[PDB]
Design an enzyme around this catalytic site. Structure first.
Site, mmCIF file in Angstrom:
data_model
loop_
_atom_site.group_PDB
_atom_site.id
_atom_site.type_symbol
_atom_site.label_atom_id
_atom_site.label_comp_id
_atom_site.label_asym_id
_atom_site.label_seq_id
_atom_site.Cartn_x
_atom_site.Cartn_y
_atom_site.Cartn_z
ATOM 1 N N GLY B 46 52.680 30.384 22.038
ATOM 2 C CA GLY B 46 51.585 30.792 22.897
ATOM 3 C C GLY B 46 50.746 29.622 23.364
ATOM 4 O O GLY B 46 50.722 28.551 22.746
ATOM 5 N N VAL B 53 49.869 27.794 19.637
ATOM 6 C CA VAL B 53 50.437 28.357 18.420
ATOM 7 C C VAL B 53 51.915 28.003 18.408
ATOM 8 O O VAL B 53 52.624 28.244 19.390
ATOM 9 C CB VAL B 53 50.243 29.882 18.338
ATOM 10 C CG1 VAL B 53 50.576 30.379 16.942
ATOM 11 C CG2 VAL B 53 48.822 30.265 18.722
ATOM 12 N N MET B 114 49.819 31.443 9.354
ATOM 13 C CA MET B 114 49.768 32.881 9.158
ATOM 14 C C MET B 114 51.161 33.469 9.341
ATOM 15 O O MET B 114 52.116 32.765 9.685
ATOM 16 C CB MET B 114 48.710 33.471 10.097
ATOM 17 C CG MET B 114 48.917 33.110 11.554
ATOM 18 S SD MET B 114 47.579 33.721 12.591
ATOM 19 C CE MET B 114 47.764 32.666 14.025
ATOM 20 N N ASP B 161 36.943 40.693 18.417
ATOM 21 C CA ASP B 161 37.765 40.233 19.535
ATOM 22 C C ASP B 161 39.039 41.067 19.676
ATOM 23 O O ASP B 161 40.158 40.559 19.646
ATOM 24 C CB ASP B 161 38.098 38.753 19.357
ATOM 25 C CG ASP B 161 38.565 38.103 20.642
ATOM 26 O OD1 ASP B 161 38.557 38.780 21.690
ATOM 27 O OD2 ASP B 161 38.955 36.917 20.598
ATOM 28 N N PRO B 164 44.593 42.747 23.920
ATOM 29 C CA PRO B 164 46.062 42.824 23.816
ATOM 30 C C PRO B 164 46.724 41.607 23.192
ATOM 31 O O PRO B 164 47.754 41.757 22.522
ATOM 32 C CB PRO B 164 46.500 43.005 25.275
ATOM 33 C CG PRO B 164 45.352 43.675 25.924
ATOM 34 C CD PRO B 164 44.123 43.104 25.270
ATOM 35 N N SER B 165 46.167 40.409 23.376
ATOM 36 C CA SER B 165 46.784 39.210 22.823
ATOM 37 C C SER B 165 46.443 38.981 21.359
ATOM 38 O O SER B 165 46.947 38.021 20.766
ATOM 39 C CB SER B 165 46.377 37.979 23.636
ATOM 40 O OG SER B 165 44.970 37.896 23.770
ATOM 41 N N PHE B 180 40.582 37.757 13.897
ATOM 42 C CA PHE B 180 39.290 38.404 13.712
ATOM 43 C C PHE B 180 38.306 37.462 13.025
ATOM 44 O O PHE B 180 38.683 36.452 12.427
ATOM 45 C CB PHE B 180 39.408 39.722 12.931
ATOM 46 C CG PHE B 180 40.259 39.651 11.693
ATOM 47 C CD1 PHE B 180 39.708 39.260 10.484
ATOM 48 C CD2 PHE B 180 41.594 40.013 11.727
ATOM 49 C CE1 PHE B 180 40.477 39.212 9.337
ATOM 50 C CE2 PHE B 180 42.366 39.964 10.583
ATOM 51 C CZ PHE B 180 41.807 39.560 9.387
ATOM 52 N N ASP B 188 30.568 30.357 15.610
ATOM 53 C CA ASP B 188 29.646 29.496 16.346
ATOM 54 C C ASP B 188 30.384 28.372 17.062
ATOM 55 O O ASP B 188 30.060 28.036 18.208
ATOM 56 C CB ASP B 188 28.599 28.918 15.393
ATOM 57 C CG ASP B 188 27.658 29.973 14.848
ATOM 58 O OD1 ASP B 188 27.544 31.052 15.462
ATOM 59 O OD2 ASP B 188 27.030 29.720 13.798
HETATM 60 C C1 CHU Z 1 35.066 36.968 21.426
HETATM 61 N N1 CHU Z 1 34.377 37.370 20.205
HETATM 62 S S1 CHU Z 1 33.325 36.332 19.511
HETATM 63 O O1 CHU Z 1 32.671 37.059 18.448
HETATM 64 O O2 CHU Z 1 32.544 35.724 20.567
HETATM 65 N N2 CHU Z 1 34.166 35.045 18.849
HETATM 66 C C2 CHU Z 1 35.062 35.136 17.796
HETATM 67 N N3 CHU Z 1 35.626 36.304 17.567
HETATM 68 C C3 CHU Z 1 36.487 36.403 16.558
HETATM 69 C C4 CHU Z 1 36.816 35.344 15.741
HETATM 70 C C5 CHU Z 1 36.238 34.090 15.953
HETATM 71 C C6 CHU Z 1 36.599 32.929 15.047
HETATM 72 C C7 CHU Z 1 37.884 33.148 14.277
HETATM 73 C C8 CHU Z 1 39.124 32.954 14.790
HETATM 74 C C9 CHU Z 1 39.389 32.725 16.242
HETATM 75 C C10 CHU Z 1 40.283 33.107 13.933
HETATM 76 C C11 CHU Z 1 41.593 32.938 14.389
HETATM 77 C C12 CHU Z 1 42.669 33.087 13.547
HETATM 78 C C13 CHU Z 1 42.462 33.424 12.214
HETATM 79 O O3 CHU Z 1 43.567 33.557 11.401
HETATM 80 C C14 CHU Z 1 44.022 34.725 10.901
HETATM 81 N N4 CHU Z 1 45.020 34.682 10.039
HETATM 82 C C15 CHU Z 1 45.448 35.847 9.562
HETATM 83 C C16 CHU Z 1 44.875 37.045 9.941
HETATM 84 C C17 CHU Z 1 43.835 36.955 10.853
HETATM 85 N N5 CHU Z 1 43.397 35.801 11.340
HETATM 86 C C18 CHU Z 1 41.180 33.593 11.716
HETATM 87 C C19 CHU Z 1 40.104 33.435 12.592
HETATM 88 O O4 CHU Z 1 38.855 33.608 12.102
HETATM 89 C C20 CHU Z 1 37.732 33.479 12.861
HETATM 90 O O5 CHU Z 1 36.674 33.638 12.301
HETATM 91 C C21 CHU Z 1 35.344 34.011 17.002
HETATM 92 F F1 CHU Z 1 34.725 32.862 17.309
HETATM 93 N N1 ANP Z 2 51.013 34.852 13.651
HETATM 94 C C1 ANP Z 2 51.559 34.893 14.868
HETATM 95 N N2 ANP Z 2 52.830 35.278 15.029
HETATM 96 C C2 ANP Z 2 53.344 35.311 16.257
HETATM 97 N N3 ANP Z 2 52.750 35.003 17.395
HETATM 98 C C3 ANP Z 2 51.488 34.620 17.207
HETATM 99 C C4 ANP Z 2 50.819 34.537 15.999
HETATM 100 N N4 ANP Z 2 49.531 34.117 16.179
HETATM 101 C C5 ANP Z 2 49.429 33.949 17.463
HETATM 102 N N5 ANP Z 2 50.580 34.234 18.143
HETATM 103 C C6 ANP Z 2 50.820 34.175 19.578
HETATM 104 O O1 ANP Z 2 49.956 33.270 20.184
HETATM 105 C C7 ANP Z 2 49.684 33.701 21.521
HETATM 106 C C8 ANP Z 2 48.380 33.161 22.060
HETATM 107 O O2 ANP Z 2 47.337 33.454 21.167
HETATM 108 P P1 ANP Z 2 45.832 32.787 21.288
HETATM 109 O O3 ANP Z 2 46.006 31.286 21.159
HETATM 110 O O4 ANP Z 2 45.000 33.541 20.306
HETATM 111 O O5 ANP Z 2 45.338 33.094 22.791
HETATM 112 P P2 ANP Z 2 45.037 34.616 23.485
HETATM 113 O O6 ANP Z 2 44.904 35.528 22.295
HETATM 114 O O7 ANP Z 2 46.200 34.823 24.408
HETATM 115 N N6 ANP Z 2 43.524 34.425 24.169
HETATM 116 P P3 ANP Z 2 42.132 33.557 23.438
HETATM 117 O O8 ANP Z 2 41.835 34.501 22.269
HETATM 118 O O9 ANP Z 2 41.042 33.468 24.511
HETATM 119 O O10 ANP Z 2 42.694 32.199 23.027
HETATM 120 C C9 ANP Z 2 49.670 35.228 21.415
HETATM 121 O O11 ANP Z 2 50.087 35.829 22.580
HETATM 122 C C10 ANP Z 2 50.531 35.550 20.199
HETATM 123 O O12 ANP Z 2 51.714 36.170 20.622
#
Ligand code: CHU
Ligand code: ANP
Ligand code: 324
Lengths: 266, 322
Positions: B46, B53, B114, B161, B164-165, B180, B188
């Site tokens: 992605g 990713v 992950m 957040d 769909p993605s 999440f 922040d």
């Molecule tokens: C758009 N909404 S917002 O509230 O402004 N900003 C944010 N919203 C959500 C989240 C965040 C920050 C955030 C991100 C981006 C994250 C990405 C991957 C992740 O890994 C993971 N691994 C396994 C299972 C589930 N996650 C854990 C993560 O924890 C976080 O706290 C915002 F910054």
């Molecule tokens: N654990 C995972 N396994 C498979 N695909 C993943 C995994 N984590 C992320 N991806 C892929 O990474 C792609 C892009 O994710 P991401 O970098 O979060 O950007 P986005 O969700 O498309 N928008 P934004 O949240 O603004 O960055 C997604 O479309 C997922 O398919």
């Protein structure tokens, strides 16, 4: 081409410095230390080739001690621009990562030099369009160099880095061209805020989409109560003047410069 | 180790789910502290507005993982606190939440490793399927509603957040949530460091008023419409574009302004069921208090219908991507 194209065999890429969405910045060697920004574009279209040579033409017109020194470009293998290497870090890292203890006289000098560089750009009819403290580099700590201007021709294929420095008229994007000397002034104003508070604006809002809406409506603006107590009261006025919501109420850089120069006469 | 397995028994699992969760936890024990040197790159999965990713292989264990690179310039104290707050993901083991292996900081990027999902995000799925069939959007809804209530009860956390993605799918027919808000410092940091082209943000969150998981329900409803029809719905479809997807652009601020001022989008009548239409209408109520909540959604007619409908989700997925 012209005489600023650099053959790739002459440049030796060393370490990786930064990596945004529009390109990647490596430290390198080409008659001493150098910086190379390589664009993430593997299939450059004849259109993007022209926009690149156009943005290079704009870079070709800047020669000023507060503007990052353009040195050459590469257009065959990949699209890249070669500039001088600044030994210090960006102003963002100084203020928000390392938290370096600048004194009040140094902050005003950084403010003045930044205005000096911006004044030069506007005098050459160049709009930065994406000014932040990430793009201000402190060469060896003493002199600021402004970069990441130009290539707004190729980046549009509104900035996509951050919204913290965007003027309200630029956030709303209601005009086909909201970018002006005063949108740059607003961005410069936000850098002034960083300099005079030590932190970024909207520190209590953590939702980019909230920031976009609140600043576009006028419900939010930099909190000037966090300005340093030693910050001169004329400097406090200058922050407010640059950050004004109305595009036509903002000072231009000849006035901003004079305000700082007279302040500098303690 | 076995403290993780005790919290498995506090959940209401079935026979096939406990099998897979127990198998993933044993693989979590193969890997230790992760580092950039431990990984061999396989492919790229992605290019979000955020961070790239990669599909990767962890050399000591042999496991295949998904590695999210998040580039951020933050002081070292924030770096360490972000990794500390991300460790709550070791305890986030649920059929509806993607798995976690470990997180670390290298160069100028936080790496989050992950569970790999070969189906990808429903964003990626949508652009291959055109639109998603309603039967499947029922099963997706269930997965989202279950993942949100799991987070709120077992962790007291919101997704923040839902898009769909950020919904991923497996060849085994699993639908899980990802990205999440576990780390408050990461929240922040990513507000200052990125920009957005679209928004699934609830109108109450855009205006700064108090919000709850209801905001995530609004985001789910907006995602369901976007997956039902084949387009993001904030600018409602033209009288022409509707008659170009079933037969018989705005800047980010203008989107956010629309979500606050103009009525929410609706499912186009006649092409979808009435209950599904009523389902998204209860999710897209502007006033959060009069919007459907999580228990109401689980007893809504559309969910009790979809939960009973035995669908071959795993099959449809492998048919539409390969
Ligand atoms: C758009 N909404 S917002 O509230 O402004 N900003 C944010 N919203 C959500 C989240 C965040 C920050 C955030 C991100 C981006 C994250 C990405 C991957 C992740 O890994 C993971 N691994 C396994 C299972 C589930 N996650 C854990 C993560 O924890 C976080 O706290 C915002 F910054
Ligand atoms: N654990 C995972 N396994 C498979 N695909 C993943 C995994 N984590 C992320 N991806 C892929 O990474 C792609 C892009 O994710 P991401 O970098 O979060 O950007 P986005 O969700 O498309 N928008 P934004 O949240 O603004 O960055 C997604 O479309 C997922 O398919
Ligand atoms: C004359 C301006 C050329 S630019 O506008 O394309 N900007 C640009 C081009 C190439 C670059 F390498 C950079 C850059 O980021 C740096 C240049 N010198 C540096 N010194 C230190 C750091 Cl951290 C970064 C840089 C840069 F900002």
């Amino acid at each position: 081409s012209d005489d600023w194209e650099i053959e790739a065999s002459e440049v030796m890429l060393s370490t990786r410095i930064g990596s945004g969405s529009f390109g990647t910045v490596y430290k390198g060697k080409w008659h001493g230390d150098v910086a190379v920004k390589i664009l993430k574009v593997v299939d450059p279209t004849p259109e993007q080739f022209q926009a690149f040579r156009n943005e290079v033409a704009v870079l070709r017109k800047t020669r000023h001690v507060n503007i990052l020194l353009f040195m050459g470009y590469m257009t065959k293998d990949n699209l890249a621009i070669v500039t001088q290497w600044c030994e210090g870090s960006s102003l963002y890292k100084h203020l928000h990562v390392q938290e370096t203890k600048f004194q009040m006289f140094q902050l005003i000098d950084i403010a003045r030099q930044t205005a000096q560089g911006m004044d030069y750009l506007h005098a050459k009819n160049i709009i930065h369009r994406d000014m932040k403290s990430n793009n201000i580099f402190l060469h060896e700590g003493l002199t600021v160099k402004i970069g990441d201007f130009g290539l707004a021709t190729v980046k549009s294929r509104q900035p996509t880095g951050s919204v913290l420095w965007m003027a309200p008229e630029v956030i709303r994007m209601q005009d086909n061209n909201p970018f002006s000397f005063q949108s740059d002034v607003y961005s410069y104003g936000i850098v002034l805020y960083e300099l005079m508070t030590g932190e970024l604006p909207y520190s209590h809002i953590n939702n980019r989409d909230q920031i976009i809406f609140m600043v576009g409506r006028g419900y939010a603006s930099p909190d000037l109560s966090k300005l340093y107590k030693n910050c001169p009261k004329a400097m406090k006025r200058l922050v407010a003047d640059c950050v004004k919501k109305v595009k036509e109420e903002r000072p231009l850089f000849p006035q901003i410069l004079s305000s700082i120069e007279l302040l500098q006469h303690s | 180790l076995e403290a993780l397995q005790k919290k498995l028994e506090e959940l209401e699992l079935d026979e096939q789910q406990r099998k897979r969760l127990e198998a993933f936890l044993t693989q979590k024990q193969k890997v230790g502290e992760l580092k950039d040197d431990d990984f061999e790159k396989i492919s790229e999965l992605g290019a979000g507005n955020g961070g790239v990713v990669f599909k990767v292989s962890h050399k000591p264990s042999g496991l295949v993982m998904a590695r999210k690179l998040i580039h951020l310039e933050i002081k070292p104290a924030i770096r360490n606190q972000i990794i500390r707050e991300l460790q709550v993901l070791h305890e986030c083991n649920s059929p509806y939440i993607v798995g976690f292996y470990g997180a670390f900081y290298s160069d100028g990027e936080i790496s989050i490793c992950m569970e790999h999902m070969d189906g990808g995000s429903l964003d990626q799925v949508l652009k291959k399927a055109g639109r998603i069939p309603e039967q499947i959007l029922g099963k997706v809804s269930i997965a989202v509603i279950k993942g949100l209530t799991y987070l709120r009860e077992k962790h007291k956390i919101m997704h923040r957040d839902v898009k769909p993605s950020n919904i991923l799918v497996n060849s085994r027919g699993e639908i899980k949530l990802c990205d999440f808000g576990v780390s408050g410092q990461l929240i922040d940091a990513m507000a200052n460091a990125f920009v957005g082209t679209r928004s699934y943000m609830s109108p109450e969150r855009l205006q700064g008023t108090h919000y709850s998981v209801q905001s995530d329900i609004w985001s789910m409803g907006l995602s369901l419409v976007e997956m039902a029809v084949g387009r993001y719905p904030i600018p409602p479809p033209d009288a022409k574009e509707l008659e170009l997807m079933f037969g018989c652009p705005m800047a980010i601020f203008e989107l956010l302004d629309y979500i606050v001022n103009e009525p929410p989008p609706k499912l186009p009548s006649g092409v979808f069921s009435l209950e599904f239409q009523d389902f998204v209408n209860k999710c897209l109520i502007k006033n959060p208090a009069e919007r459907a909540d999580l228990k109401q959604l689980m007893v809504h007619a559309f969910i009790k219908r979809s939960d009973a409908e035995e669908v071959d989700f795993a099959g449809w997925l492998c048919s539409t991507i390969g």
